[PDB]
Design a protein around this ligand. Structure first.
Ligand SMILES: Cc1cccc(NC(=O)[C@H]2CCCN2)n1
Length: 182
């Protein structure tokens, strides 16, 4: 409807797939080559469904910071016959706060969903479902199950993926450029 939603749609329509694990359907962001991200709590195994196609997982890493604290991002390399548009140049280099963010989700259940979540806070530490978690972004929107893996964008930047919420607020794990140095 405006430039915020224009940037979000541009990411969703080229750089997401529907990922299915035994824990459910997730919005999965593709970053470059056959490399994609998903919340760690999706529990990625050796085989994953990608747009309902059985797909071997070539590698997967649940990321932690150098303090050995959970980041709640799993980076997946997919045995797929097609590369993602390379969007690594939209990723921020540093931890930050933002204005005017959009949370965008695409599953069988929530296709073509865009939420204007507003101001994004560099919240930092959160006890997320009993897991100490670092580099958490917070927005004041009442997010619901089905939105995990949702992409958080400003105009010009892909800043994070939705990983949880408490009924009043939503929580995203930061994406940083340094996660995807080739
Ligand atoms: C069903 C299940 C099994 C094991 C662990 C969990 N969840 C967690 O640890 C959290 C904290 C970080 C995000 N999800 N949930």
């Amino acid at each position: 409807m405006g430039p915020g939603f224009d940037f979000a749609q541009a990411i969703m329509k080229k750089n997401t797939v529907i990922a299915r694990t035994e824990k459910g359907e997730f919005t999965m962001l593709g970053v470059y080559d056959r490399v994609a991200v998903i919340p760690t709590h999706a529990s990625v195994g050796e085989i994953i469904y990608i747009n309902d196609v059985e797909t071997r997982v070539l590698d997967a890493c649940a990321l932690r910071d150098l303090t050995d604290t959970n980041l709640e991002i799993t980076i997946v390399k997919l045995d797929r016959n097609q590369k993602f548009r390379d969007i690594r140049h939209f990723l921020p280099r540093c931890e930050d706060d933002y204005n005017d963010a959009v949370l965008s989700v695409h599953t069988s259940k929530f296709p073509n969903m865009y939420i204007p979540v507003g101001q994004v806070t560099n919240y930092g530490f959160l006890n997320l479902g009993g897991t100490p978690t670092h580099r958490i972004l917070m927005y004041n929107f009442p997010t619901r199950a089905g939105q995990c893996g949702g992409v958080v964008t400003t105009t010009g930047k892909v800043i994070g993926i939705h990983v949880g919420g408490n009924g009043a607020q939503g929580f995203a794990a930061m994406l940083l450029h340094s996660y995807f140095t080739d």
